[PDB]
Scaffold this active site. Structure first.
Site: not given
Ligand SMILES: Nc1ccn([C@H]2C[C@H](O)[C@@H](COP(=O)(O)O)O2)c(=O)n1
Length: 121
Positions: A42, A118-119, A14, A9, A45-46
């Site tokens: 969304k 996870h960011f 990312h 994910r 987002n990065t």
């Protein structure tokens, strides 16, 4: 385990090592390609423009505290394109402004070996 699916994910949402800069057209394309406009747009987002293994490596930097209070976050400086939903976007025509820069990021890592999942920020 189920950490791999979190890792994937993260990669999907990312990681784009191939580009390095970002214009609006990149964001609009990539936000769609990476499945972040299928239901709704969304909002923000990065995308990180570094090799998957340079990123995985961040997990070996000193531990720091996540925003949720856990201690498995890690900070590092990387090339990004940040995509923001413009004022003129709608579903289904999601539309964005790119903002390319080289900047600090924080990622949660989990697993053995430790991968990013996870960011954080
Ligand atoms: N520039 C950023 C920073 C963070 N997030 C999102 C990614 C994560 O999915 C979410 C936090 O939830 P999760 O626990 O699923 O990582 O915040 C994002 O979309 N873009």
């Amino acid at each position: 385990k189920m950490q791999d699916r979190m890792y994937q994910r993260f990669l999907r949402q990312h990681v784009d090592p191939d580009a390095t800069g970002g214009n609006d057209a990149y964001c609009n394309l990539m936000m769609q390609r990476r499945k972040m406009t299928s239901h709704y747009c969304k909002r923000f987002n990065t995308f990180i423009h570094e090799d998957i293994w340079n990123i995985r490596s961040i997990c070996s930097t000193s531990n720091i505290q996540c925003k949720n209070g856990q201690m498995n976050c890690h900070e590092g400086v990387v090339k990004v394109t940040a995509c923001r939903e413009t004022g003129s976007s709608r579903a289904p025509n999601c539309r964005y402004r790119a903002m390319a820069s080289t900047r600090r990021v924080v990622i949660a890592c989990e697993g053995n070996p430790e991968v990013p999942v996870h960011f954080d920020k």
